[PDB]
């Protein structure tokens, strides 16, 4: 049965963490996959987690099985972040959210629920975007139509091109959007260009659907949810796939949300009926721990305060490495302008280096990053950032 | 968009657990969900499993993601569980694994691996078997068949209908097996009809996909394994599904694994290639707590034997239950023969009482079972037997 299998395309991304373990360079730089690393270079679990683990080993007297959708506080926490305390979506009940194995996990379910309980055909996704999107609404049996994002010269959001190019979309197609922290570009709409996307989305018919993985790095965590928001006053009805994975450093405890939105109360508990049927025969209910963590954090106000804090250090980290970078790069003598990689938001921006140029880096200089250019600054620190700027430089 | 969505249809079983929470009624008796109790009616975390979770809270540094495969050392553990060390099959590295969210989560993986990589078009299940195995084959897009199993006059294997019945499979399709403590008849086949079927599966071209929740509740680790190790001693290719929810008390940390085998370590491999691609466009890896409690265990001395020690506890607590259901029987007035319960494996057996029967029960006695009259023998206890057993002579 298995002997014509044909094996599948490497995936470079995971190709590249699994080409970095192998190096046994020691001065090796790795700004590939979306981490956060601390200064010196370690990718901690944070504090508020360790405190909150405790609690869970202390306190937990069983591990039965949680409800398909997961701990119901955990729901009510990850709303409140979403829609904003008191938010109207949640007075009405409007909402309704599984806890998912990741963002990713998140994603996948909200593609299979589309697929097999609405009309949906085709899912618009921003070019560039994270690969992944295509993958898994493709995997789902859904096709993927791309819009303009990108200024490339000017480094910012060609927003007439994805204007224009989301004029190909029908009513009932999805448009996905990056609540904050577009990966790969670092640039975000204003808050007047999400409204007036949220206004283009209801006239034209749009199911939206929002990615939000960063909440919390671009700005902060209620300024992050602005482009949200801004739909979730507008529209009846909305996806939001969340995840806690870089926001808590919980990346391998699979912590995520799918929260469904519908225009009432009746509506939403019973779309969201057939939401848990597709949960139930995927993972059946999803893993406790990394939620736990998240829902004990989020409802207590001394570990909240203390989880906060440590958010917002990591946030500061990357401004800081972001401002280090750009001035390093002129101290070191490279020819261009990368003062826009200070305003952009999140882990990444996309350095402008070519395909040719990452290679040499890795190469030469044990520097790793990915084929489009896109640099991880959270993998930067004042320790690595001279070696690294050296490499660029020398490339350029 | 989701204005017309219809509700899913109410899950009579989970809409069971939803019942029981409900209902105010002091003693209240629990039969339904494949949960382990102890004597007094709660559900613990294993001793092993505790200490290995303080381990993990004062050595884990990070939450790093893991591959898309898990952690490789509970890949290891559970290869040399399934097909015991020393195996040709480990040694001829004919085996990958992938940690999966649960025994359901693997099921749900190989399904769509199969649908996606190779001609198979259905999967056959026993007629009865646990209901979500229709309902996460069919999500895959696979049809599902049932071969005959159950003499209920005798409360036996009914080894020549099944024989036949199988008879109408086609080379190339799945047949499910159930390693032991089949869900929900409690009946197994003997060393000796193992082998009868994995000779019988090689004549006819079947791929075997076992479903292996339940290692170490019939006789024991390795005793448990057998049939497994028949078909593998025979098989070019087979799939496992594996969980340990119940063997660790895991439930709800998602802990489980899906095996593939090959002929040889180069098909394994680009077919497990292909494995691993529909597990990035699902959840995208693993949840990690789970899974490294179970390879914190099963790779140190000391904690493997309290585990194992802890495992064969539940076993026999089971085993107990089983003789004292049956002798409370009789002492209470049962006219029936229940002998056939103490020979049965695992948490369940049919008790052979009817839907109304088990209606009644609940109604008016507070004692849930599911409608198919099957029974969660671990939920019984010394204490609510009698209660238990009063109330069934009641309803007969």
């Known amino acids: 049965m298995f002997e014509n299998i044909t094996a599948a395309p490497a995936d470079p991304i995971l190709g590249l963490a699994d080409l970095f373990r192998a190096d046994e360079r020691p001065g090796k730089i790795n700004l590939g996959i979306g981490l956060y690393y601390d200064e010196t270079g370690k990718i901690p679990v944070l504090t508020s987690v360790k405190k909150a683990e405790q609690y ?10 949680l409800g398909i959708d997961g701990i119901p506080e955990f729901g009510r926490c990850t709303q409140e972040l979403l829609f904003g305390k008191g938010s109207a979506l949640i007075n009405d009940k409007r909402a309704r959210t599984a806890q998912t194995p990741g963002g990713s996990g998140a994603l996948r379910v909200a593609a299979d629920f589309l697929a097999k309980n609405t009309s949906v055909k085709r899912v618009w996704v921003s070019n560039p975007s994270w690969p992944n999107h295509k993958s898994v609404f493709n995997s789902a049996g859904l096709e993927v139509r791309e819009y303009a ?18 004029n190909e979309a029908q009513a009932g197609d999805v448009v996905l959007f990056h609540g904050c ?41 209620e300024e992050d949810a602005e482009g949200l928001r801004a739909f979730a006053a507008m529209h009846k009805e909305l996806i939001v796939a969340s995840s806690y994975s870089k926001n808590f450093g919980l990346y391998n405890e699979r912590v995520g949300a799918c929260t469904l939105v519908a225009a009432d109360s009746e509506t ?12 139930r025969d995927n993972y059946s209910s999803p893993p ?34 972001r401002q280090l970078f750009v001035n390093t790069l002129q101290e070191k003598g490279a020819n261009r302008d990368f003062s826009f990689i200070i305003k952009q938001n999140g882990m990444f921006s996309f350095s402008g280096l070519t395909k040719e ?20 600054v959270a993998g930067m620190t004042p320790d690595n950032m001279a070696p690294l700027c050296e490499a660029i430089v020398a490339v350029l």
């Open 56 to 65: 869970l080993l202390e306190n937990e007297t069983t591990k039965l099985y």
């Open 149 to 166: 994002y990108y200024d490339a010269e000017n480094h910012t959001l060609d927003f007439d091109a994805l204007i224009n190019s989301l």
């Open 181 to 221: 922290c577009h990966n790969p570009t670092g640039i975000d709409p204003t808050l007047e260009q999400w409204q007036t996307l949220a206004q283009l989305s209801v006239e034209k018919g749009w199911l939206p659907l929002f990615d939000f993985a960063y909440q919390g790095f671009a700005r902060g965590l």
């Open 268 to 279: 939403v508990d019973r779309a969201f009926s057939q939401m848990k049927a597709a949960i």
């Open 288 to 321: 406790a721990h990394g939620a736990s963590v998240v829902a004990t954090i989020l409802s207590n106000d001394a570990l909240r305060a203390i989880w906060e804090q440590e958010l917002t250090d990591m946030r500061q980290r990357i401004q800081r490495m």
């Open 357 to 376: 140029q990452v290679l040499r880096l890795r190469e030469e200089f044990g520097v790793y990053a990915v084929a489009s250019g896109r640099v991880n």
